[PDB]
Amino acid sequence: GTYTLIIRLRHNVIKTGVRMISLSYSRISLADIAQKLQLDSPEDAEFIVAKAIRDGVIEASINHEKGYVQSKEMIDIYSTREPQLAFHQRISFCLDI
Amino acid sequence: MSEKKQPVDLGLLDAHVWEDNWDDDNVEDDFSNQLRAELEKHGYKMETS
Amino acid sequence: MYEQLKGEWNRKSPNLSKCGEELGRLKLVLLELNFLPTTGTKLTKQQLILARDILEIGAQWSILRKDIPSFERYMAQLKCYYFDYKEQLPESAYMHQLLGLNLLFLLSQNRVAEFHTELERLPAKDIQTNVYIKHPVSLEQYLMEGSYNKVFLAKGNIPAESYTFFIDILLDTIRDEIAGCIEKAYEKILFTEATRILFFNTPKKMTDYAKKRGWVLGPNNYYSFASQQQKPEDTTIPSTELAKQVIEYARQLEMIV
Amino acid sequence: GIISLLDEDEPQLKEFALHKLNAVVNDFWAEISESVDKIEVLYEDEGFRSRQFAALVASKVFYHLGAFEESLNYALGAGDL
Amino acid sequence: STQNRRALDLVAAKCYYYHARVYEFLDKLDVVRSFLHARLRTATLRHDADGQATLLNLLLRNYLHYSLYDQAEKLVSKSVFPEQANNNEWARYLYYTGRIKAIQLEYSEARRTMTNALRKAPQHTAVGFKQTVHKLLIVVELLLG
């Protein structure tokens, strides 16, 4: 009683491949993404990568003319306000207990 | 207390006593079945160039 | 049995004096008894087979007149009658074609959630039978990843009819998805590439997009605002709400519980 | 579903459709909910007939949703039925 | 109402469960679901505890036995009542809502809720639905990447 979920799995297969590639490198040409993913055309590699960007799989942007894909790096989450929130929630829970 | 009554059922019912302590699943997956002869992986690569 | 039907059903009625007769017959079938099952008169199948025939033929000639708001009435009612079952023979000329057509319509409105939730009602005809049903899910599968060239080229192969009123709006919603994807902060695109990426050589429809959405194409540059940083150093809003917060911590800490 | 019959014009047709819904509401209320606005359109408008039935079915669905002020208002509106 | 405290504190709660099981065991389910709707409605007014937990689970159970709409009910359900639960029923309620979320092309947030479901099962030897929830969790996590 779970056949239909796995009947659509091939596309997420290719998605997982490109995600691991995204986590590996930072600056990479499209003349290799399709080459090492067995994808013959480098035109539709643009499309699959762009969709992967749309739904939040990878954070990179694309320079359509240049031909390279680079991913931005965002760090220093300690300085933001969110850890205070994460801690306040737990404070509330413990006092509740 | 721990009633665990369940309409959902058990479902089903080795030659694998080689417990390598723990895990290796990712490790065995890394070199699933290829790139075996690491000696040859070096040797037949130094003669290549 | 109160038929009055065998005149221009098979022959085409291009907006003939027909919709009045459909209204009359639907009123009458309302009058005769159960236009929707209440459970009874099981052996009475004629008011049932007649009903399903009327509805399906009405929808079939409704797609011709392109009544997209009404079309859902007929399709929903056909869905209602395909599942009471009783002992009625299921098979018709359709019961496949009408479902494939419903599937296309539902996809072209770009609402794939209920599309996928409807695949849970036909358990073994999906990858085996009814090419009428294998074509639409194949199309959705191709749309799931970014491969679109095959989707455009698939227009040569169509199961039953032109289906135009369902594939043309599909190509337009593909226009929409591509436009929504090719955004994000990229560089200048000259006035040739984004025009020839989809379909159109050099008409003003690209100009319609340009003057319809943003990307002022001043120095040949199409730019979309995809930074949206905002949120500057704003300690003050913390300085208020965090004080509220800490006062509360100390409130329910020493008061007697 | 059958609710779609409220879109077509025919007053007799609509006065059949909503006249039957109040039999199955007792468990289809969760479905019906997404159209109570459209049902209410046919209430407190004189261009309809047995309008108190529309009011009644509104009070039914709101009662299931627990918006008890809505239910009471539409019960006062339906009156004698 | 007079003995509602005791009568609905238990006995009734488990009764509904067993009576439903019978029907599932070798029978149909339909007028059972009509009866369940009625019995849920008569709760939520006089009482608001465990009469809204067992019934919710059973009703969603028989909806999922077939393959109906299955969502338009959760949104207005008011959720399995918190503040009190046997922590057991919370588990399968989470499992049900997890599945009905996964089938409707909503992946990312399904894994977290169903993992929260799994962590609430006991330490007991039964692997009845632990196998099921694990199997579903694996298959949803092969989605994404």
XYZ file of C-alpha atoms in Angstrom:
629
model
C 0.000 0.000 0.000
C 2.782 2.439 -0.881
C 3.567 1.670 -4.524
C 2.449 4.960 -6.012
C 4.831 7.023 -3.913
C 7.831 5.136 -5.236
C 6.542 5.054 -8.793
C 7.523 8.728 -9.212
C 10.992 8.385 -7.704
C 13.280 8.717 -10.749
C 13.029 12.484 -10.955
C 13.949 12.933 -7.324
C 16.818 10.567 -8.175
C 18.288 13.135 -10.518
C 17.482 15.808 -7.934
C 19.533 14.032 -5.278
C 22.468 13.764 -7.653
C 22.514 17.462 -8.394
C 22.077 18.305 -4.715
C 25.173 16.397 -3.683
C 27.053 18.160 -6.465
C 25.853 21.487 -5.097
C 27.168 20.634 -1.672
C 30.538 19.550 -3.078
C 31.777 22.537 -5.084
C 31.186 26.281 -5.040
C 32.119 27.688 -8.467
C 31.535 25.287 -11.362
C 30.892 25.536 -15.099
C 27.851 24.022 -16.776
C 30.231 22.333 -19.132
C 30.688 19.723 -16.435
C 27.421 19.431 -14.501
C 25.720 17.617 -17.345
C 28.947 15.908 -18.389
C 29.334 14.120 -15.068
C 25.580 13.527 -14.639
C 25.324 11.663 -17.984
C 23.013 14.420 -19.212
C 23.859 15.024 -22.855
C 22.415 18.457 -23.295
C 23.722 21.505 -21.406
C 20.626 23.564 -22.221
C 18.206 21.648 -19.992
C 20.817 21.488 -17.255
C 20.067 25.171 -16.875
C 16.415 24.332 -16.352
C 16.834 21.532 -13.850
C 19.291 23.614 -11.850
C 17.006 26.630 -11.939
C 14.069 24.624 -10.648
C 16.253 23.160 -7.934
C 17.039 26.739 -6.955
C 13.385 27.749 -7.032
C 12.180 25.294 -4.415
C 15.186 25.854 -2.181
C 17.279 22.763 -2.854
C 20.469 24.780 -3.438
C 21.287 28.416 -2.740
C 23.370 29.225 -5.821
C 22.669 31.773 -8.543
C 23.429 31.531 -12.263
C 25.245 33.864 -14.649
C 23.497 32.882 -17.876
C 25.981 34.649 -20.147
C 29.130 33.683 -18.260
C 28.383 29.978 -17.842
C 29.456 29.464 -14.230
C 27.302 28.682 -11.204
C 28.375 29.995 -7.813
C 26.741 29.503 -4.433
C 26.572 32.206 -1.800
C 27.831 31.532 1.721
C 25.912 32.904 4.706
C 27.510 32.490 8.114
C 27.551 33.936 11.638
C 24.176 32.746 12.847
C 25.289 33.356 16.425
C 25.022 37.130 16.004
C 21.367 37.040 14.911
C 18.286 37.010 17.139
C 17.124 33.470 16.396
C 19.112 31.587 19.097
C 17.461 33.805 21.678
C 14.093 32.614 20.364
C 15.067 28.959 20.340
C 16.176 29.295 23.940
C 13.129 31.252 25.085
C 10.800 28.515 23.903
C 12.616 25.940 26.024
C 12.684 28.252 29.038
C 8.917 28.504 28.813
C 8.517 24.746 28.531
C 10.693 23.998 31.542
C 8.863 26.464 33.760
C 5.627 24.877 32.581
C 6.855 21.464 33.700
C 0.747 0.868 30.841
C 2.504 -0.197 27.630
C -0.765 -1.505 26.196
C 0.512 -1.515 22.599
C -2.612 -3.197 21.282
C -2.327 -2.931 17.560
C -4.613 -3.540 14.573
C -1.448 -3.096 12.565
C 0.266 -6.470 12.503
C 3.705 -8.070 12.781
C 3.814 -8.608 9.029
C 6.663 -11.060 8.525
C 8.877 -13.523 10.357
C 21.172 -15.195 8.191
C 24.791 -15.741 7.085
C 25.672 -12.329 8.493
C 27.333 -12.936 11.875
C 30.098 -10.652 10.588
C 29.247 -7.742 12.826
C 32.140 -5.319 12.306
C 31.313 -3.725 15.655
C 29.272 -0.890 14.181
C 28.073 0.719 10.965
C 30.399 0.557 7.879
C 27.173 0.932 5.889
C 28.224 4.304 4.550
C 31.773 2.964 4.439
C 30.902 -0.161 2.459
C 28.661 2.021 0.325
C 31.556 4.352 -0.502
C 33.510 1.542 -2.164
C 30.389 -0.379 -3.061
C 32.014 -2.758 -5.515
C 34.486 -0.799 -7.666
C 37.865 0.939 -7.557
C 39.077 -2.241 -5.931
C 42.772 -2.735 -6.652
C 44.070 0.339 -4.869
C 47.588 -0.949 -5.393
C 46.807 -1.079 -9.085
C 44.877 2.181 -8.740
C 48.161 3.899 -7.926
C 50.556 1.771 -9.971
C 48.659 1.814 -13.234
C 48.252 5.555 -12.697
C 51.905 6.475 -12.284
C 52.764 4.798 -15.585
C 49.859 6.609 -17.252
C 51.775 9.887 -17.094
C -39.018 6.567 -22.226
C -39.370 10.333 -22.532
C -36.384 10.400 -24.870
C -36.925 13.235 -27.375
C -33.203 12.933 -27.966
C -32.405 11.101 -31.190
C -32.405 14.191 -33.401
C -29.076 16.045 -33.251
C -27.099 14.093 -30.695
C -24.792 12.287 -33.114
C -24.939 15.082 -35.670
C -23.229 18.301 -34.638
C -25.351 21.147 -33.243
C -23.096 24.204 -33.475
C -25.015 26.327 -30.963
C -28.286 25.024 -32.340
C -31.599 25.250 -30.508
C -30.208 22.609 -28.169
C -29.261 24.068 -24.790
C -32.960 24.707 -24.307
C -33.637 21.033 -24.885
C -30.879 20.087 -22.459
C -32.474 22.370 -19.885
C -35.840 20.759 -20.534
C -34.486 17.233 -20.230
C -32.543 17.990 -17.062
C -35.660 19.523 -15.539
C -37.634 16.447 -16.537
C -35.082 13.966 -15.197
C -35.183 15.972 -11.982
C -38.952 15.575 -12.037
C -38.996 11.839 -12.700
C -37.144 10.884 -9.523
C -33.619 10.665 -8.164
C -31.209 12.754 -10.201
C -28.698 11.859 -7.485
C -28.933 8.539 -5.662
C -31.065 8.275 -2.561
C -30.791 4.432 -2.612
C -33.684 2.455 -4.052
C -35.253 1.144 -7.246
C -32.152 -0.903 -7.989
C -33.516 -2.782 -10.994
C -34.486 0.589 -12.471
C -31.431 1.191 -14.627
C -32.929 3.151 -17.522
C -33.215 6.352 -15.506
C -29.560 5.706 -14.586
C -28.000 4.750 -17.909
C -30.032 7.533 -19.502
C -28.739 9.987 -16.908
C -25.093 9.084 -17.410
C -25.488 9.174 -21.195
C -27.114 12.609 -21.025
C -24.399 14.000 -18.792
C -21.493 12.612 -20.789
C -22.876 13.754 -24.128
C -23.601 17.167 -22.656
C -20.022 17.552 -21.483
C -18.702 16.278 -24.805
C -20.626 18.968 -26.657
C -19.837 21.463 -23.903
C -16.108 21.396 -24.546
C -16.952 22.526 -28.071
C -18.656 25.676 -26.828
C -15.822 26.210 -24.309
C -17.963 26.685 -21.188
C -15.068 26.271 -18.771
C -17.143 27.455 -15.773
C -19.995 25.073 -16.586
C -17.828 22.120 -17.742
C -17.095 21.328 -14.118
C -20.771 20.712 -13.415
C -20.958 17.888 -15.916
C -17.591 16.442 -14.995
C -18.378 16.405 -11.276
C -21.773 14.814 -11.841
C -20.240 12.141 -14.057
C -17.801 11.485 -11.228
C -20.752 11.086 -8.878
C -22.328 8.479 -11.149
C -19.130 6.544 -11.747
C -19.038 5.460 -8.096
C -22.543 4.553 -6.859
C -22.015 1.371 -8.906
C -24.928 -0.710 -7.577
C -25.004 -3.344 -10.293
C -24.828 -0.973 -13.258
C -22.462 -1.987 -16.011
C -19.492 0.396 -15.712
C -18.205 0.300 -19.266
C -19.131 2.964 -21.774
C -17.503 4.279 -24.912
C -15.729 6.557 -22.445
C -15.159 6.072 -18.653
C -11.569 6.454 -19.832
C -11.621 9.292 -22.329
C -13.686 11.489 -20.032
C -11.272 10.855 -17.186
C -8.240 11.618 -19.322
C -9.894 14.836 -20.434
C -10.733 15.744 -16.829
C -7.114 15.033 -15.967
C -5.813 17.376 -18.661
C -8.178 20.128 -17.588
C -7.165 19.761 -13.971
C -3.482 19.921 -14.869
C -3.827 22.983 -17.093
C -5.250 25.003 -14.226
C -1.821 24.466 -12.625
C -3.211 22.768 -9.519
C -1.233 19.535 -9.344
C -2.226 18.742 -5.766
C -5.705 17.499 -6.555
C -4.331 16.077 -9.805
C -2.170 13.781 -7.723
C -4.925 13.086 -5.220
C -7.171 11.831 -8.004
C -4.739 9.102 -9.029
C -6.038 7.169 -6.021
C -9.114 5.762 -7.715
C -7.925 3.593 -10.657
C -5.560 0.918 -9.369
C -4.322 -1.129 -12.338
C -4.999 0.834 -15.538
C -2.267 3.401 -14.970
C 0.804 1.900 -16.632
C -1.020 -0.891 -18.478
C -4.253 0.128 -20.200
C -6.138 3.153 -21.518
C -3.571 5.120 -23.523
C -6.079 7.892 -22.843
C -4.762 7.791 -19.264
C -1.125 6.977 -19.946
C -0.625 10.118 -22.023
C -1.588 12.704 -19.346
C 0.435 11.221 -16.515
C 3.358 10.911 -18.908
C 2.997 14.617 -19.619
C 2.937 15.457 -15.920
C 5.978 13.258 -15.351
C 7.882 15.185 -17.996
C 6.783 18.442 -16.388
C 8.041 17.229 -13.018
C 11.662 17.695 -14.000
C 12.808 20.574 -16.148
C 12.845 18.724 -19.448
C 10.465 20.696 -21.652
C 11.640 20.177 -25.224
C 9.949 16.795 -25.350
C 6.787 18.397 -23.967
C 6.666 20.911 -26.811
C 7.485 18.243 -29.379
C 4.825 15.857 -28.038
C 2.114 17.858 -29.810
C 2.460 15.598 -32.846
C 1.084 12.630 -30.897
C -2.415 13.089 -29.435
C -4.667 10.256 -28.147
C -8.160 11.068 -29.410
C -8.912 14.568 -30.745
C -7.340 18.005 -31.062
C -7.857 18.647 -27.324
C -6.869 22.182 -28.250
C -8.819 23.963 -25.544
C -6.777 22.011 -22.987
C -3.278 21.963 -24.484
C -3.150 25.593 -25.600
C -3.707 26.889 -22.086
C -1.180 24.273 -21.015
C 1.411 25.874 -23.272
C 0.488 29.245 -21.810
C 0.918 28.029 -18.248
C 4.288 26.626 -19.346
C 5.052 30.173 -20.472
C 4.143 31.270 -16.964
C 6.274 28.675 -15.187
C 9.327 29.391 -17.338
C 8.926 33.096 -16.650
C 8.628 32.453 -12.924
C 11.758 30.295 -13.029
C 14.107 32.360 -15.232
C 13.940 35.005 -12.552
C 16.412 35.386 -9.655
C 19.160 37.995 -9.819
C 20.971 37.285 -13.066
C 22.818 39.431 -15.571
C 21.768 41.333 -18.669
C 19.958 39.316 -21.318
C 20.010 40.794 -24.785
C 16.843 41.275 -26.818
C 17.321 37.966 -28.597
C 17.892 35.191 -26.087
C 14.877 35.350 -23.784
C 12.831 35.834 -26.944
C 14.068 32.694 -28.699
C 14.266 30.473 -25.611
C 10.581 29.552 -25.687
C 8.820 29.782 -29.056
C 8.444 33.161 -30.659
C 10.848 34.637 -33.210
C 10.575 38.374 -32.632
C 6.957 39.477 -32.172
C 5.598 41.997 -29.677
C 4.400 39.330 -27.245
C 7.850 39.452 -25.680
C 7.285 43.193 -25.568
C 3.945 42.426 -23.922
C 5.782 40.477 -21.242
C 8.287 43.294 -20.822
C 5.718 46.067 -20.459
C 3.462 43.687 -18.510
C 5.938 42.581 -15.860
C 9.070 44.452 -14.768
C 12.684 44.285 -16.002
C 13.116 47.734 -17.520
C 15.209 46.896 -20.579
C 17.113 50.176 -20.676
C 20.745 49.368 -21.487
C 19.737 45.967 -22.940
C 19.510 44.807 -19.319
C 16.627 42.750 -17.969
C 16.898 42.992 -14.190
C 14.696 41.438 -11.514
C 15.012 42.598 -7.910
C 16.223 39.480 -6.099
C 18.141 40.878 -3.132
C 15.469 42.000 -0.618
C 17.837 42.261 2.333
C 15.992 44.905 4.426
C 16.134 44.135 8.228
C 18.837 46.579 9.378
C 20.370 46.833 12.837
C 17.188 47.361 14.829
C 17.938 46.718 18.500
C 14.942 48.802 19.618
C 12.150 46.334 18.793
C 14.118 43.791 20.835
C 14.601 46.447 23.484
C 10.866 46.530 23.997
C 9.638 42.996 23.471
C 12.578 41.333 25.226
C 11.897 43.501 28.255
C 8.308 42.267 28.187
C 9.652 38.730 27.972
C 12.076 38.952 30.884
C 9.547 40.690 33.101
C 7.305 37.693 32.501
C 10.079 35.226 33.381
C 10.566 36.943 36.702
C 6.809 37.199 37.176
C 6.041 33.505 37.191
C 9.166 32.581 39.129
C 8.594 33.741 42.695
C 4.823 34.182 42.842
C 3.147 31.418 44.797
C 1.816 28.629 42.593
C -20.431 17.613 -6.278
C -24.148 18.330 -6.181
C -23.438 21.735 -4.630
C -22.500 22.897 -8.123
C -26.227 23.076 -8.907
C -26.363 26.357 -6.980
C -24.461 28.099 -9.784
C -26.987 27.567 -12.590
C -29.822 30.055 -12.687
C -33.011 28.006 -12.577
C -34.888 28.904 -9.363
C -36.742 25.582 -9.304
C -33.457 23.718 -9.771
C -31.749 25.514 -6.886
C -34.850 25.113 -4.730
C -34.513 21.376 -5.306
C -30.768 21.212 -4.654
C -30.674 23.068 -1.360
C -33.925 21.368 -0.390
C -32.137 18.042 -0.536
C -28.772 19.047 0.959
C -30.276 19.462 4.444
C -30.651 15.680 4.545
C -26.941 14.841 4.102
C -25.538 17.913 5.866
C -25.509 15.903 9.135
C -22.173 14.534 8.065
C -21.136 16.338 4.898
C -20.838 19.645 6.791
C -17.046 19.580 6.499
C -17.363 19.601 2.716
C -20.291 22.007 2.651
C -18.353 24.576 4.720
C -16.363 25.844 1.746
C -19.506 27.275 0.130
C -21.606 28.740 2.957
C -20.928 32.204 1.532
C -22.508 31.154 -1.750
C -25.475 29.630 0.070
C -25.843 32.861 2.051
C -25.974 34.802 -1.209
C -29.400 33.223 -1.761
C -30.531 34.529 1.633
C -31.784 37.994 2.560
C -32.250 38.609 -1.149
C -35.814 38.772 -2.417
C -34.970 37.232 -5.789
C -35.566 33.756 -4.395
C -38.203 31.496 -2.921
C -38.480 29.419 0.260
C -35.455 31.520 1.266
C -35.988 30.426 4.862
C -34.646 27.032 3.745
C -31.363 28.697 2.812
C -31.319 30.318 6.244
C -31.997 26.957 7.905
C -29.196 25.152 6.109
C -26.849 28.000 7.020
C -27.695 27.569 10.696
C -27.048 23.839 10.311
C -23.557 24.201 8.877
C -22.569 26.953 11.306
C -23.831 24.803 14.176
C -21.464 22.053 13.111
C -18.645 24.600 12.850
C -19.451 25.945 16.318
C -19.796 29.577 15.178
C -22.829 29.780 17.420
C -23.565 33.477 16.880
C -23.826 32.857 13.135
C -26.147 29.921 13.808
C -28.387 31.934 16.119
C -28.589 34.882 13.728
C -29.593 32.664 10.836
C -32.096 30.802 13.009
C -33.786 34.094 13.852
C -33.670 34.793 10.131
C -35.263 31.494 9.126
C -37.990 31.902 11.720
C -40.857 29.439 11.662
C -39.539 26.530 9.569
C -24.530 13.539 31.791
C -25.400 12.097 35.218
C -22.617 9.500 35.177
C -20.855 11.027 32.172
C -17.666 11.439 34.189
C -17.276 7.706 34.744
C -19.224 6.485 31.717
C -17.093 8.434 29.248
C -13.912 8.422 31.328
C -13.322 4.956 29.897
C -15.394 1.879 29.042
C -17.168 3.938 26.408
C -13.863 5.089 24.971
C -12.587 1.549 24.566
C -16.025 0.233 23.649
C -16.157 2.362 20.524
C -12.759 0.970 19.578
C -13.721 -2.668 19.926
C -17.108 -2.215 18.277
C -15.366 -0.640 15.306
C -12.796 -3.433 15.172
C -15.528 -6.072 14.881
C -16.893 -4.405 11.778
C -13.452 -4.100 10.258
C -12.776 -7.723 11.172
C -15.364 -9.260 8.916
C -17.864 -6.701 7.737
C -18.411 -3.338 6.086
C -17.620 0.083 7.558
C -20.139 2.594 6.294
C -23.075 3.036 8.663
C -20.315 2.700 11.218
C -18.861 5.941 9.906
C -22.247 7.633 9.999
C -22.659 6.511 13.599
C -19.172 7.766 14.391
C -19.912 11.192 12.956
C -23.026 11.398 15.097
C -21.190 10.263 18.220
C -18.402 12.777 17.670
C -21.000 15.503 17.307
C -22.691 14.629 20.584
C -19.269 15.002 22.184
C -17.412 18.315 21.804
C -20.466 19.823 23.515
C -20.998 18.074 26.854
C -17.436 16.763 27.033
C -14.089 17.574 25.466
C -11.658 14.776 26.354
C -10.956 11.351 24.815
C -14.310 11.562 23.145
C -12.487 13.665 20.586
C -9.403 11.465 20.448
C -10.557 7.892 19.900
C -13.328 8.939 17.528
C -11.032 11.161 15.491
C -8.547 8.353 14.993
C -11.183 5.756 14.132
C -12.966 8.024 11.685
C -9.789 8.966 9.892
C -8.904 5.271 9.915
C -11.911 4.224 7.935
C -11.572 7.160 5.577
C -8.068 5.972 4.811
C -9.207 2.372 4.401
C -10.727 3.612 1.167
C -8.996 6.479 -0.649
C -11.326 9.453 -0.333
C -10.620 13.212 -0.148
C -9.393 12.853 3.446
C -8.198 16.444 4.058
C -11.212 18.744 4.297
C -11.829 17.204 7.722
C -8.513 17.944 9.428
C -8.522 21.710 8.784
C -11.668 22.291 10.881
C -11.079 19.295 13.142
C -9.630 21.514 15.963
C -6.809 18.928 16.186
C -6.615 16.080 18.650
C -7.289 17.822 21.903
C -4.062 18.746 23.699
C -3.766 19.392 27.444
C -4.719 15.741 27.793
C -3.975 12.663 25.717
C -2.732 9.209 26.415
C 0.306 10.188 24.338
C -0.500 6.969 22.528
C -3.326 8.367 20.425
C -1.205 11.387 19.642
C 1.173 8.988 17.932
C -1.237 7.511 15.446
C -2.979 10.831 14.879
C 0.374 12.224 13.826
C 0.955 9.211 11.625
C -2.354 9.691 9.841
C -1.897 13.385 9.225
C 1.632 12.676 8.077
C 0.468 10.266 5.425
C -2.348 12.463 4.173
C 0.169 15.270 3.928
C 2.702 13.211 2.013
C 0.343 11.990 -0.679
C -0.685 15.558 -1.567
C 2.778 16.649 -2.725
C 3.885 18.268 0.522
C 7.166 16.638 1.350
C 9.466 18.834 3.377
C 7.338 19.218 6.465
C 6.005 15.665 6.425
C 9.259 14.156 7.684
C 9.466 16.287 10.801
C 5.903 15.625 11.906
C 6.097 11.906 11.298
C 9.444 11.656 13.076
C 7.771 13.383 15.997
C 5.141 10.684 15.663
C 7.716 7.910 15.847
C 9.521 9.247 18.897
C 6.293 8.963 20.909
C 5.823 5.204 20.588
C 6.644 3.093 23.653
C 9.597 0.772 24.309
C 7.342 -2.264 23.908
C 8.353 -5.257 21.804
C 5.533 -4.815 19.275
C 6.836 -3.714 15.897
C 3.393 -3.519 14.399
C 3.309 0.059 13.222
C 6.916 0.959 13.969
C 7.801 -0.966 10.828
C 5.112 0.938 8.960
C 6.150 4.402 10.059
C 9.820 3.617 9.467
C 9.026 2.374 5.985
C 7.099 5.526 5.132
C 9.813 7.708 6.630
C 12.486 6.091 4.498
C 10.440 6.504 1.367
C 9.666 10.181 1.963
C 13.285 10.898 2.714
C 14.385 9.341 -0.546
C 12.421 12.215 -2.019
C 13.999 15.632 -1.532
C 17.701 14.814 -1.915
